[model samples]
Target: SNAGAIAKLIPKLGELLVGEYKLHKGVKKNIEDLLKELKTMNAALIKIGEVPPDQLDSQDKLWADEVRELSYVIEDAVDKFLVRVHGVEPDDNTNGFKGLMKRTTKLLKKVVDKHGIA
Candidate 1:
């Protein structure tokens, strides 16, 4: 269940960048940074995905719930603020991260923009 939330959050982060959302021109680097960490975090949690949810122990369940809640907090933040800002995620976290950097450079304005994408 916790894994499900992060799964949703991961894609939500991805989906936020799809173009048209009003994210700060400068906020992309930070967003991508968080994106990297979330991708990594999802990798570890996917182990839980491999296991049987019903068979999972209590501590594992507890720890998973913690991240799940945190993921939702971030997700809500985007829904409220970033929609005021770009709307946008997918495969190969490695390959995609490189493209994200380039894409930001392409769209980023000459002056540093002030706003929080998180």
Candidate 2:
């Protein structure tokens, strides 16, 4: 039920988080909390997978679906926020971040070259 793609992106998000940018007071704490929650939820889903499906009732199935849906919701929310802050990059091996940084560096290099600073 856990979305592994979203789960994989969690670490990348954590790595992108840094102190250089001003992120509203306490926003950092909130993001950290969110990261923790996503990790916990993902782990819980993995643990749930070990349970025999035959033992789960219809209600359990329904609840499991709801939980999995929430994971998707959180992933969407985080992904959107990242896009807003970093601007959306083409989805690829870099998951958009590496592309963003590459574009930024390219722009800087252009400026440096124009100024004969390269």
Candidate 3:
């Protein structure tokens, strides 16, 4: 039902919300309410998972299809996440950040070479 979809959407709404003021505003109350609603929807999903679709019962073709579709999305997400987390900017040469990176990489290479694991 559409109501079930709406129930799932409440958490996303809460995540986008910021307090009205920069320093002190009352977002916690909204977050707490949304958390309770999210828990309820998650419980419903668990209940549904226990019985699953009849289409999934016999051949298991749908599971394979979903896995194939999700694998691309999962890999793309992981690459994007790693770039956002561990990657350094290539064009940030104004400050000493680039120099620091080069020094760090050189030191790392030297250590690895010393260990004979180069």
Which candidate leads in lDDT?
A: 1
- Model 2, poorest ten-residue lDDT window? 109-118
Better of 1 and 2 by lDDT: 1
Off by more than 4 A, model 3: 1-25, 55-118
Q: Look at candidate 1 and tell me the lDDT of residue 2.
A: 42
Best by TM-score: 1
Using TM-score, rank the candidates from best to worst: 1, 2, 3
TM-score of 2: 0.45
The lDDT for every candidate, in the order shown, is 0.49, 0.49, 0.37
lDDT of 2 at 9: 47
TM-score per candidate:
0.47, 0.45, 0.26
lDDT of 2 by residue, 12-118 (tens): 44743554333443444444544554565455557666877787687666544543444443453355456656765433454443543353344334334434322
Give residue 23's error in model 3 in angstroms.
Answer: 5.6
Residue-level lDDT of model 3, residues 13-60, one tens digit each, is 344244322212232343334334344433443544466467345434
RMSD of each: 14.0, 18.9, 20.2
TM-score between model 1 and native = 0.47
Model 2 gets an lDDT of 0.49
Error (Å) of candidate 1 at residue 93 is 29
